[PDB]
Design an enzyme around this catalytic site. Sequence first.
Site, PDB file in Angstrom:
ATOM      1  N   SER A 161       0.835  -1.203   0.000  1.00 13.73           N
ATOM      2  CA  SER A 161       0.000   0.000   0.000  1.00 13.73           C
ATOM      3  C   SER A 161       0.872   1.257   0.000  1.00 13.73           C
ATOM      4  CB  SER A 161      -0.944  -0.001   1.211  1.00 13.73           C
ATOM      5  OG  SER A 161      -2.060   0.848   0.960  1.00 13.73           O
ATOM      6  N   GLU A 203      -9.080  -5.084  -3.705  1.00  8.47           N
ATOM      7  CA  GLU A 203      -8.424  -3.955  -3.056  1.00  8.47           C
ATOM      8  C   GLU A 203      -9.347  -2.911  -2.437  1.00  8.47           C
ATOM      9  OE1 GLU A 203      -5.270  -3.967  -2.620  1.00  8.47           O
ATOM     10  OE2 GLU A 203      -4.333  -5.135  -4.209  1.00  8.47           O
ATOM     11  N   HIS A 249      -7.285  -6.181   0.862  1.00 10.12           N
ATOM     12  CA  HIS A 249      -6.079  -5.365   0.730  1.00 10.12           C
ATOM     13  C   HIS A 249      -5.203  -5.657   1.954  1.00 10.12           C
ATOM     14  CE1 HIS A 249      -3.762  -1.656  -0.054  1.00 10.12           C
ATOM     15  NE2 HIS A 249      -4.019  -1.245   1.176  1.00 10.12           N
TER      16      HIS A 249
HETATM   17  C1  LIG Z   1      -2.363   1.714   2.061  1.00  9.50           C
HETATM   18  C2  LIG Z   1      -3.377   2.773   1.616  1.00  9.50           C
HETATM   19  O1  LIG Z   1      -1.187   2.315   2.613  1.00  9.50           O
HETATM   20  C3  LIG Z   1      -3.462   1.111   2.950  1.00  9.50           C
HETATM   21  C4  LIG Z   1      -2.875   0.071   3.907  1.00  9.50           C
HETATM   22  C5  LIG Z   1      -3.910  -0.494   4.892  1.00  9.50           C
HETATM   23  N1  LIG Z   1      -3.576  -1.589   5.837  1.00  9.50           N
HETATM   24  C6  LIG Z   1      -4.780  -1.831   6.656  1.00  9.50           C
HETATM   25  C7  LIG Z   1      -3.278  -2.876   5.176  1.00  9.50           C
HETATM   26  C8  LIG Z   1      -2.510  -1.279   6.808  1.00  9.50           C
END
Ligand SMILES: *[C@](C)(O)CCC[N+](C)(C)C
EC number: 3.1.1.7
Lengths: 532, 528
Positions: free
Chosen positions: B197, B324, B437
């Site tokens: 992410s 996602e 995700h």
């Molecule tokens: C990404 C938008 O950085 C989201 C990550 C979310 N988690 C819940 C997997 C940490």
Amino acid sequence: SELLVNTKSGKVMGTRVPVLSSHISAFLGIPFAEPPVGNMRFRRPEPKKPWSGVWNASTYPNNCQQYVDEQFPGFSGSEMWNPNREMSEDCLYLNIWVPSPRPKSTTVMVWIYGGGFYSGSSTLDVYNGKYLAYTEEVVLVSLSYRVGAFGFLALHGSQEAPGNVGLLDQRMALQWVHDNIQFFGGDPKTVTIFGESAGGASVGMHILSPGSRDLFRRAILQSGSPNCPWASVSVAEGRRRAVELGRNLNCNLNSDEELIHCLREKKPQELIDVEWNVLPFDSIFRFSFVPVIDGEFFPTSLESMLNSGNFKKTQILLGVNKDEGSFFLLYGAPGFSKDSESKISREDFMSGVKLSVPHANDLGLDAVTLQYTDWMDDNNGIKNRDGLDDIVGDHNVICPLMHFVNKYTKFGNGTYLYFFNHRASNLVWPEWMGVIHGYEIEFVFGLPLVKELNYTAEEEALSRRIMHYWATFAKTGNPNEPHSQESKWPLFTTKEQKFIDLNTEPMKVHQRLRVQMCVFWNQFLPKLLNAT
Amino acid sequence: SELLVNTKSGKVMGTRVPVLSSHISAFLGIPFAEPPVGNMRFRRPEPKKPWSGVWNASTYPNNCQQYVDEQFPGFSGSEMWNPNREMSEDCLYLNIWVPSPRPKSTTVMVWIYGGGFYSGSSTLDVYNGKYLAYTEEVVLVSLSYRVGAFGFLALHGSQEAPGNVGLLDQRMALQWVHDNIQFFGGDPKTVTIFGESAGGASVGMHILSPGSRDLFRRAILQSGSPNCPWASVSVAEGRRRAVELGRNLNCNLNSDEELIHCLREKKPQELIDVEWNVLPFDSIFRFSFVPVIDGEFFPTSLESMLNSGNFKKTQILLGVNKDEGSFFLLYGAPGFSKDSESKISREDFMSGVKLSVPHANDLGLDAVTLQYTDWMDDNNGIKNRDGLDDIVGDHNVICPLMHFVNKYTKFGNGTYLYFFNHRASNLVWPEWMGVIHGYEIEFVFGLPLVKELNYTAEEEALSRRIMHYWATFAKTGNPNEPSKWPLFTTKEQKFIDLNTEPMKVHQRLRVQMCVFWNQFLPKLLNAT
Ligand SMILES: *[C@](C)(O)CCC[N+](C)(C)C
Ligand SMILES: *[C@@H]1O[C@H](CO)[C@@H](O)[C@H](O)[C@H]1NC(C)=O
Ligand SMILES: *[C@@H]1O[C@H](CO)[C@@H](O)[C@H](O)[C@H]1NC(C)=O
Ligand SMILES: *[C@@H]1O[C@H](CO)[C@@H](O)[C@H](O)[C@H]1NC(C)=O
Ligand SMILES: *[C@@H]1O[C@H](CO)[C@@H](O)[C@H](O)[C@H]1NC(C)=O
Ligand SMILES: *[C@](C)(O)CCC[N+](C)(C)C
Ligand SMILES: C[C@H](O)CCC[N+](C)(C)C
Ligand SMILES: C[C@H](O)CCC[N+](C)(C)C
Ligand SMILES: [Cl-]
Ligand SMILES: [Cl-]
Ligand SMILES: [Cl-]
Ligand SMILES: [Cl-]
């Protein structure tokens, strides 16, 4: 004497014509208007003045002056649509088929040929009304109207070339049926008007126009509707094209009077030869001279009229054919050919979309392309071909007709929608073209009922049930016969939007004819092109 | 000692830890920068000054100050992402797991956590690096960096809060590895940075930044790319948001110094409390303080950099998960619930897309709507749910990543693409959310290898081949050892599914939808 009928304008003598081991009466070439020649060209039609003696009505009349298709010389597939009689500006006549013995006051069906408003004849073999009139026992009328510049040249303001005179020619033929059909055994209170393509758009235009409303009871529209993108133009575009025609013939453009006077001195074939030069862009499924939204024949924009319910409220039966666009791709798009599978490359695909949606901007083009392209396999010749076929058919015929059927049904008194998808076993056109624009007509007129034409037994049965659907609808406003055992053609409702496929297999009921694509064409694309 | 290592900043004492009926060395909480507290808030990180004596590296460090998700208290599915230890502004530390006995010049992998740049911790259970380090015998490093306003408040022009300090914190940790990993048995010339992410977007940004390029050899991006719509803002939007933060707290907005000085007097939780109040629209998958295109860390726009090929040219291995978007629909879109199928009405669908593409006009919304609505059956709740799910995932993760993969491959030295679509058997979230995700992370870190977690034997095997693909890749630039994961090329554009079933090669991952999001929509919004 069945053959000697006296009308309001004079006596007429028909002829006994053989048909399916039997016989019927035919009255061919009866005039309903004065010959629009000389100073009459471009002018509104005038009622035929009474004649003395007996008018010989045993032979077909002349066909109006028009562009003739010579792409495929000798080829029946295309020549069956060309004039089969000498062309002449003096062409405002009508034909009639009457069951024998003469009915007392039976159902009447009036046919309006199509041909993009630039061609068409009432005398083609495919329009021979003897089979239908005989099998369903109806009084069948075949009318005619001026096409091309002669019937649709429009210079708003002038009373010499007001525009829509071809539509007025049609109206005058219906007015004649209204005043004289009773003498041929028909009930003028029960006349159904039906037409295909430009014919279907015409039928739809009479439904909208206040001046035509009381001239018929019901209406059938085949592969054509009033709101099609090619069926009409604004007064401005009509003048532009009218002035562009004069310029192509070195005419005096200083005034409507001089321009029109110039165009009246010209020979029929001179106007015809430059007809296509007045079009806005390179295109397909676009015609030079068509009806114009004038504020007279047509009160206001077709759209506002449909939204407000300002139109004749009655029963309508309409539909389309599976492959409405193939015929037009063959004639004006790169990569298409009658003697080949016609696999379209990606380059030709792009060219085709530009060709099909000429009024669109670069953004509207990308939208169309994306909507009909399978990106997991964009170089697939077959998908690109069928893709273009769908584009042309959806944009020009299918979706505009759905728009119409949905708008109409909110105020109408009974809608029946059909989807014709049967490929005749004896089609002379290539397989890739599919169920071609206009080939449902032969089934409507019963051509399959004649042995030497070589249709299959199943095609004859299909023809018989289609003619029965049409006639029964003409008589009652419902294609179905009460308390009958055969599957029922259901009503099209705003809620369920049902429709049937028309073929040789048992009936099937479907819903929402091509909704996905028509949402794109009827709602999304317009909003996109309207932006800036 | 195997646990006592002398780094260039001082000595550190690790701890022998048990792992799968065996052991490895663990050095937890090693400082790589000076505590960014007081007047150092919002300021670029400064290197950790040397210390005398032995630094106790036996326990995890504090996590950075961040927003904490309290939507579902006690629920493990959401809590496993929350800080598992005291939060503090002094949070710039890193962790290292070394196989025992200490290898020599072995491959190094640096983990960068995600969290939308507003959260995340290096100490999460799911980021426990012992299983991967042991199983694949690599030196695993997990770093940390400031999030939220603390790490991304941007006031271009000023040098007290210049923006991008969270990325600069990551760079300083990599620099630290560059100079000290050798003392732990790692090979400084063979470092692979990887993250999910926001962590994946960070990896991508280091590939693009001139000042980061020489700090690593290869890169792995999981569900994130530098060009995602939520991953960055302009200097103007950064300043606007920064000023709105001051306003929310009643700060002197006369000048940057006055604004900053004011914001530096507030307690951490005060800023965090109003953080979300600075977004310009009501939306989902959008975060307040993210990296900014400053012309310094990022020379020019990400796009122009991608077209001109101005970026590190090496091997990359990236991919996405099947669903996602579900996680973000659940938290901010009407009609969704953790305790139901979540059939979305038509009205809620409309509400959802608007929320998903806050920047689009009415024509753009209609475009998204038509593109994802099956008009032969528009009042179907399951289809409307799945459509919104695909809308959020395609627009925010899948298509931005595909745009990146195609641009990079034209200049890169080797691309490997994957599509993770396996649904964990012990997942605690509802089924409608699918392959969520971030839930491929547990497979990358070998969590399925431990019995007490109740994974299936088939999943353990999956985790083993994923760890082997990741490790083998990090050490050679190819996930395959001498079924083969085919290379992604501009021509064939191949990728592989990643599940418990025999490998399958595909082509053009969601090309249809990505043509819409990468070419059509952009062009439409620019024209209207
Ligand atoms: C990404 C938008 O950085 C989201 C990550 C979310 N988690 C819940 C997997 C940490
Ligand atoms: C009418 O025309 C037909 C066809 O030429 C002809 O056979 C018939 O004798 C004509 N009738 C008369 C007497 O005019
Ligand atoms: C048509 O109109 C008649 C009388 O107004 C009404 O009884 C009938 O239900 C209508 N039919 C349809 C299908 O609208
Ligand atoms: C390091 O800190 C841990 C936890 O506070 C403690 O248990 C350990 O004794 C310390 N190391 C030593 C032995 O100094
Ligand atoms: C990577 O770069 C090397 C050296 O320039 C080249 O020989 C090789 O073909 C490249 N590999 C790929 C897959 O681009
Ligand atoms: C419609 C545009 O009027 C076209 C009708 C053409 N034929 C070939 C079917 C007569
Ligand atoms: C519809 C049709 O074939 C058009 C006639 C051909 N051009 C335009 C070339 C004269
Ligand atoms: C996924 C996530 O927790 C979104 C953040 C929720 N609000 C805006 C309520 C703080
Ligand atoms: Cl529609
Ligand atoms: Cl364990
Ligand atoms: Cl805690
Ligand atoms: Cl390549």
